[PDB]
Short mmCIF file of C-alpha atoms in Angstrom, two decimals:
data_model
loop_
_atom_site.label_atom_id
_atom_site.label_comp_id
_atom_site.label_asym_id
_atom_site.label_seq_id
_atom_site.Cartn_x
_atom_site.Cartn_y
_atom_site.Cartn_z
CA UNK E 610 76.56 -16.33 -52.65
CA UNK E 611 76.64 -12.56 -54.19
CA UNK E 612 73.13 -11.82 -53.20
CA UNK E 613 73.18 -13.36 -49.63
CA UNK E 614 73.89 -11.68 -46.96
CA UNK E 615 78.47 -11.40 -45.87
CA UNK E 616 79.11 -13.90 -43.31
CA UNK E 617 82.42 -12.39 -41.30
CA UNK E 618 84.55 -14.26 -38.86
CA UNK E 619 83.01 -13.05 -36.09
CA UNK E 620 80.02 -14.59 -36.83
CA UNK E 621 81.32 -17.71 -36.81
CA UNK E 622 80.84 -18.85 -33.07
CA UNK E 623 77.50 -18.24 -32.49
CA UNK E 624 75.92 -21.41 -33.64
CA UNK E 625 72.25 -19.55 -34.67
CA UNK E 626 73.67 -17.10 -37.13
CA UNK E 627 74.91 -19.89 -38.91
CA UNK E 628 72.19 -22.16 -38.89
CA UNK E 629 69.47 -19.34 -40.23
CA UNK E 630 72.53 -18.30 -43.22
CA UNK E 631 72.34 -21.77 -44.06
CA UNK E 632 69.05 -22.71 -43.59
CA UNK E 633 68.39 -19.48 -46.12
CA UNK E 634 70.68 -20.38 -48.26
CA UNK E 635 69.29 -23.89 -48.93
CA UNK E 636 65.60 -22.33 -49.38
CA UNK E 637 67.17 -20.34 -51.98
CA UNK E 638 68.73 -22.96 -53.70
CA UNK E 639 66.03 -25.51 -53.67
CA UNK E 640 63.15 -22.60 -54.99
CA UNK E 641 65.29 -21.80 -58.22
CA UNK E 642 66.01 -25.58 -58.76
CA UNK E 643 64.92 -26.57 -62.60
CA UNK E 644 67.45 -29.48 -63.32
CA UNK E 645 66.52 -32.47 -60.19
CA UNK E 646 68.87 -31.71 -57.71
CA UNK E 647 67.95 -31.65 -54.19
CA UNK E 648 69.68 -29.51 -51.50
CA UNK E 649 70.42 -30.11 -47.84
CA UNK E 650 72.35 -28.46 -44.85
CA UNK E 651 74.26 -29.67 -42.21
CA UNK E 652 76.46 -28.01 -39.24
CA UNK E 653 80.03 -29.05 -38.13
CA UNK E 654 80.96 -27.86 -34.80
CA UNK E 655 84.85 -28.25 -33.93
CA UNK E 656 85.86 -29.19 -30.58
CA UNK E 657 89.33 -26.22 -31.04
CA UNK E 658 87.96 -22.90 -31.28
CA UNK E 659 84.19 -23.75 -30.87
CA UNK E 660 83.83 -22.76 -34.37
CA UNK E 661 81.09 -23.88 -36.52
CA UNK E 662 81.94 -25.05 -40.07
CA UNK E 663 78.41 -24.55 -42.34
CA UNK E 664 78.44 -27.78 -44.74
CA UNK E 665 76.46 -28.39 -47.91
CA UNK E 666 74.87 -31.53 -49.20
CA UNK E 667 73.69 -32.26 -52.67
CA UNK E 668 72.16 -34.96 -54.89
CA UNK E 669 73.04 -34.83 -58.87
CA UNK E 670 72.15 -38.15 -60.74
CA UNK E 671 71.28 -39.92 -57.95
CA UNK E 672 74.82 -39.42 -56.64
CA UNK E 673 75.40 -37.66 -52.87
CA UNK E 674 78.21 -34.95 -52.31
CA UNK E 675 79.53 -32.91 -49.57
CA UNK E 676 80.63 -29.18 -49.74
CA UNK L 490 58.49 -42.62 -61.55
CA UNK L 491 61.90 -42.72 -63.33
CA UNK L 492 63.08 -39.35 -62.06
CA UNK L 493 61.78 -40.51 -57.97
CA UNK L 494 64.55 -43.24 -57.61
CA UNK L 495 68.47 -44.22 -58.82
CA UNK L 496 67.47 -48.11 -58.86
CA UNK L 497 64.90 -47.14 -61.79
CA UNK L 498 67.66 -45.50 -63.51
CA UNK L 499 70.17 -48.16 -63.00
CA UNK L 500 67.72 -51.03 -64.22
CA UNK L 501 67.40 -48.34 -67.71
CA UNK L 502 71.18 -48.25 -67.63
CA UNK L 503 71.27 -52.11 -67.39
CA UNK L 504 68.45 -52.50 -70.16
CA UNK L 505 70.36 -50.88 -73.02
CA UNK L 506 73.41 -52.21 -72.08
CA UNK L 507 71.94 -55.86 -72.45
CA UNK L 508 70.57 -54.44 -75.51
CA UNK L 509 73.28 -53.22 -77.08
CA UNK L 510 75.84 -56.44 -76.44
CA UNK L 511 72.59 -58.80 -77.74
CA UNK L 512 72.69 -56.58 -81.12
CA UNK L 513 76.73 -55.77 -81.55
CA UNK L 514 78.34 -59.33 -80.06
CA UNK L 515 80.93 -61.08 -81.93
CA UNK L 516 83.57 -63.72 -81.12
CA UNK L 517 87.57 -63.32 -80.43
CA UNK L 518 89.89 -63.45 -82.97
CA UNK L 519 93.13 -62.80 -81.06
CA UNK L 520 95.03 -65.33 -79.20
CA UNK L 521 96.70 -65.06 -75.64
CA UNK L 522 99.95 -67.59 -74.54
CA UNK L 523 101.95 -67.30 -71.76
CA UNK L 524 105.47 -66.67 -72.21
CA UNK L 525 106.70 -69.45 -75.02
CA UNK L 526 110.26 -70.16 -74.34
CA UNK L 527 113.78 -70.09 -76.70
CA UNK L 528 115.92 -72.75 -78.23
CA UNK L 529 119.23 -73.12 -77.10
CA UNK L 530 120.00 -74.95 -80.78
CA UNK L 531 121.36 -77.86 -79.25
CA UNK L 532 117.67 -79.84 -78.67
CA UNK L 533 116.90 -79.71 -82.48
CA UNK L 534 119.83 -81.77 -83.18
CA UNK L 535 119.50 -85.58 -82.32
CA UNK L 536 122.53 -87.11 -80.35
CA UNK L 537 123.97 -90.11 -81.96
CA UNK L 538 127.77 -91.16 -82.79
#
Protein backbone atom coordinates (compact mmCIF):
# COMPACT_ATOMS: atom_id res chain seq x y z
CA UNK A 1 0.00 0.00 0.00
CA UNK A 2 3.00 2.75 0.25
CA UNK A 3 3.69 2.67 -3.41
CA UNK A 4 0.03 2.67 -4.72
CA UNK A 5 -1.62 5.36 -5.47
CA UNK A 6 -3.90 7.43 -1.89
CA UNK A 7 -7.37 6.39 -2.11
CA UNK A 8 -9.41 9.48 -0.22
CA UNK A 9 -12.99 9.42 0.86
CA UNK A 10 -14.19 11.02 -1.88
CA UNK A 11 -13.31 8.48 -4.01
CA UNK A 12 -15.21 6.15 -2.46
CA UNK A 13 -18.66 6.40 -4.35
CA UNK A 14 -17.74 6.11 -7.67
CA UNK A 15 -17.75 2.42 -8.16
CA UNK A 16 -14.83 2.53 -11.22
CA UNK A 17 -12.13 4.19 -9.21
CA UNK A 18 -12.39 1.48 -6.97
CA UNK A 19 -12.56 -1.35 -9.10
CA UNK A 20 -9.25 -0.22 -11.32
CA UNK A 21 -7.32 0.53 -7.43
CA UNK A 22 -8.18 -2.88 -6.77
CA UNK A 23 -7.92 -4.55 -9.78
CA UNK A 24 -4.12 -2.87 -9.70
CA UNK A 25 -3.54 -3.74 -6.62
CA UNK A 26 -4.16 -7.49 -7.10
CA UNK A 27 -1.84 -7.44 -10.40
CA UNK A 28 0.69 -6.17 -8.13
CA UNK A 29 0.37 -8.63 -5.65
CA UNK A 30 0.06 -11.68 -7.74
CA UNK A 31 3.44 -10.52 -10.10
CA UNK A 32 5.76 -10.35 -6.90
CA UNK A 33 4.20 -13.64 -5.53
CA UNK A 34 7.25 -16.27 -4.70
CA UNK A 35 5.65 -18.30 -1.76
CA UNK A 36 1.99 -20.04 -3.55
CA UNK A 37 -0.46 -17.73 -2.63
CA UNK A 38 -3.02 -16.66 -4.99
CA UNK A 39 -4.81 -13.25 -4.90
CA UNK A 40 -8.33 -12.18 -5.74
CA UNK A 41 -10.65 -9.03 -5.54
CA UNK A 42 -14.02 -8.51 -4.83
CA UNK A 43 -16.41 -5.27 -4.37
CA UNK A 44 -18.98 -4.66 -1.54
CA UNK A 45 -21.48 -2.09 -2.31
CA UNK A 46 -23.65 -0.90 0.83
CA UNK A 47 -27.18 -0.17 0.40
CA UNK A 48 -26.57 3.33 3.30
CA UNK A 49 -24.37 5.72 1.75
CA UNK A 50 -23.85 3.96 -1.68
CA UNK A 51 -20.40 3.42 -0.62
CA UNK A 52 -18.25 0.79 -1.98
CA UNK A 53 -16.17 -1.29 0.48
CA UNK A 54 -12.90 -2.79 -1.74
CA UNK A 55 -12.45 -6.50 -0.25
CA UNK A 56 -9.47 -8.82 -0.56
CA UNK A 57 -9.35 -12.54 -1.00
CA UNK A 58 -6.45 -14.83 -0.45
CA UNK A 59 -5.38 -18.50 -0.50
CA UNK A 60 -2.35 -19.59 2.00
CA UNK A 61 -2.06 -23.47 2.46
CA UNK A 62 -4.89 -24.25 0.71
CA UNK A 63 -6.90 -22.23 3.22
CA UNK A 64 -9.37 -19.11 1.87
CA UNK A 65 -9.49 -15.66 3.78
CA UNK A 66 -11.23 -12.44 3.49
CA UNK A 67 -9.72 -8.91 4.06
CA UNK B 1 1.04 -31.92 -8.78
CA UNK B 2 1.33 -31.61 -4.95
CA UNK B 3 1.47 -27.82 -4.90
CA UNK B 4 -2.00 -27.72 -7.68
CA UNK B 5 -4.48 -29.12 -5.00
CA UNK B 6 -5.24 -29.21 -0.86
CA UNK B 7 -6.70 -32.93 -1.22
CA UNK B 8 -2.99 -33.98 -2.37
CA UNK B 9 -1.72 -32.32 0.62
CA UNK B 10 -4.21 -33.68 2.99
CA UNK B 11 -3.74 -37.41 1.72
CA UNK B 12 0.48 -36.45 2.59
CA UNK B 13 -0.79 -35.16 5.91
CA UNK B 14 -2.82 -38.43 6.40
CA UNK B 15 0.21 -40.68 5.14
CA UNK B 16 2.68 -39.73 7.87
CA UNK B 17 0.27 -39.59 10.36
CA UNK B 18 -0.63 -43.38 9.69
CA UNK B 19 2.99 -43.71 9.61
CA UNK B 20 3.95 -42.37 12.54
CA UNK B 21 1.08 -44.16 14.97
CA UNK B 22 2.12 -47.72 12.95
CA UNK B 23 5.90 -46.99 14.21
CA UNK B 24 5.29 -45.20 17.89
CA UNK B 25 1.88 -47.26 19.15
CA UNK B 26 1.74 -48.68 22.50
CA UNK B 27 -1.03 -49.87 24.85
CA UNK B 28 -2.73 -48.02 28.06
CA UNK B 29 -1.47 -48.36 31.25
CA UNK B 30 -3.81 -46.08 33.22
CA UNK B 31 -7.14 -47.01 34.44
CA UNK B 32 -10.50 -44.93 34.34
CA UNK B 33 -13.65 -45.73 37.10
CA UNK B 34 -16.46 -43.82 37.63
CA UNK B 35 -16.96 -42.35 40.88
CA UNK B 36 -16.37 -45.44 43.57
CA UNK B 37 -18.43 -44.71 46.54
CA UNK B 38 -17.62 -44.43 50.69
CA UNK B 39 -18.31 -46.66 53.61
CA UNK B 40 -20.51 -45.54 56.12
CA UNK B 41 -18.60 -48.26 58.65
CA UNK B 42 -21.66 -49.83 59.57
CA UNK B 43 -21.84 -52.48 56.30
CA UNK B 44 -18.40 -54.02 57.25
CA UNK B 45 -19.75 -55.18 60.43
CA UNK B 46 -22.12 -58.30 60.26
CA UNK B 47 -25.46 -57.96 62.31
CA UNK B 48 -26.01 -60.74 64.69
CA UNK B 49 -27.08 -60.79 68.58
Amino acid sequence: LIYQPTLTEADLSDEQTVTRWVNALVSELNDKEQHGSQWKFDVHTNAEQNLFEPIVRVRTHGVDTDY
Amino acid sequence: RILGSADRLMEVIREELELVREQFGDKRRTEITANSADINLEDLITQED
